[PDB]
Amino acid sequence: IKEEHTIIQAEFYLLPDKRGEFMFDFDGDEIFHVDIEKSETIWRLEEFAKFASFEAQGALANIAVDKANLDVMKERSNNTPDANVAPEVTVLSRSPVNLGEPNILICFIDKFSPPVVNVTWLRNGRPVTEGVSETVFLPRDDHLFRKFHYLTFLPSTDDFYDCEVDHWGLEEPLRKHWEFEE
């Protein structure tokens, strides 16, 4: 037998937003990330917590280095920025959709940078703020990021959904539509 895997420690610090991030990825999925402001390790799946631990302070220390380093890089490049790269957005259900059976809609935001985005779930044109969740900015093989936003929903033919995504690289917000269709 053979066990082929990849573990990645991904971290960044962004200006002028002053936002940092520290996470671990296993074969493309997030193991955990550290809530930089609260200094706490957030596991992607609750069950993971009983098998390991991670001292959040190590991530904070690394991000502190990244922040110092960013100033050095800005100085070295004479503050020459790059263009904003807009994301691709896709909406799909997590499981086969059956009327009246709870399901989850996934809004997959991909291939973009900088790692900052505004996302709004809409059900029948109205923002939904309950039963929603999101991942942090996840690494890709290249220099770009991806992210997942989720919405719990109850399949019905009277509804239609939209995932609206805004990014500094888009002319106008992008609104992706989704509706049940057996």
Partner 1 sequence: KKVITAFNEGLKGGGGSLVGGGSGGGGSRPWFLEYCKSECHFYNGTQRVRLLVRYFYNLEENLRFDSDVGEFRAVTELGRPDAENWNSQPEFLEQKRAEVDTVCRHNYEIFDNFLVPRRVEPTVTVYPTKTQPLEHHNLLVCSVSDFYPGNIEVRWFRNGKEEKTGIVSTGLVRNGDWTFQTLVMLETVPQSGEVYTCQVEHPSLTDPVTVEW
Ligand X SMILES: CC(=O)N[C@@H]1[C@@H](O)[C@H](O)[C@@H](CO)O[C@H]1O
How many angstroms separate the CA atoms of 66 and 92, rounded?
35
- Looking up tokens 């002319």 gives 171
Residue 110 binding target from partner 1, ligand X, none, CB below 5 to 8 Å by type = none
**Tokens of residue 158, six digits:** 């009277």
How many angstroms separate the CA atoms of 151 and 99, rounded?
16
* Pairing mode, strands 29-35 and 40-43: antiparallel
Residue 118 binding target from ligand X, partner 1, none, CB below 5 to 8 Å by type = ligand X
Note whether 118 binds ligand X by CB under 6 A.
yes
* Residue of 37, 38, 96, 100 that binds partner 1 (CB under 8 A): 96
* Residue of 88, 94, 124, 154 that binds partner 1 (CB under 8 A): 94
Rule CB under 6 A: which of 72-91 touch ligand X? 78
Spatial contact of 38 and 30, defined as CB atoms under 8 Å apart: no
How many angstroms separate the CA atoms of 150 and 148, rounded?
7
Residue 129 binding target from partner 1, ligand X, none, CB below 5 to 8 Å by type = none
| Beta carbon of residue 151, minimum distance to partner 1 (angstroms, whole number) | 13
**Tokens of residue 87, six digits:** 């994301």
Note whether 167 binds ligand X by CB under 6 A.
yes
Cβ-based nearer residue to partner 1, 15 or 124: 15
> What is the dihedral sign for C-alpha 125, 182, 109, 175?
negative
User: How many other CB atoms are found less than 10 A from the CB of residue 87?
Assistant: 22
Residue 81 binding target from partner 1, ligand X, none, CB below 5 to 8 Å by type = partner 1
Residue 95 binding target from partner 1, ligand X, none, CB below 5 to 8 Å by type = partner 1
> What is the dihedral sign for C-alpha 53, 56, 59, 65?
negative
Rule CB under 8 A: which of 107-166 touch partner 1? 108, 113-115, 135, 138-139, 143, 148, 150
Cβ-based nearer residue to ligand X, 114 or 139: 114
Binding footprint of ligand X on the chain (CB under 6 A):
2, 78, 118, 166-168
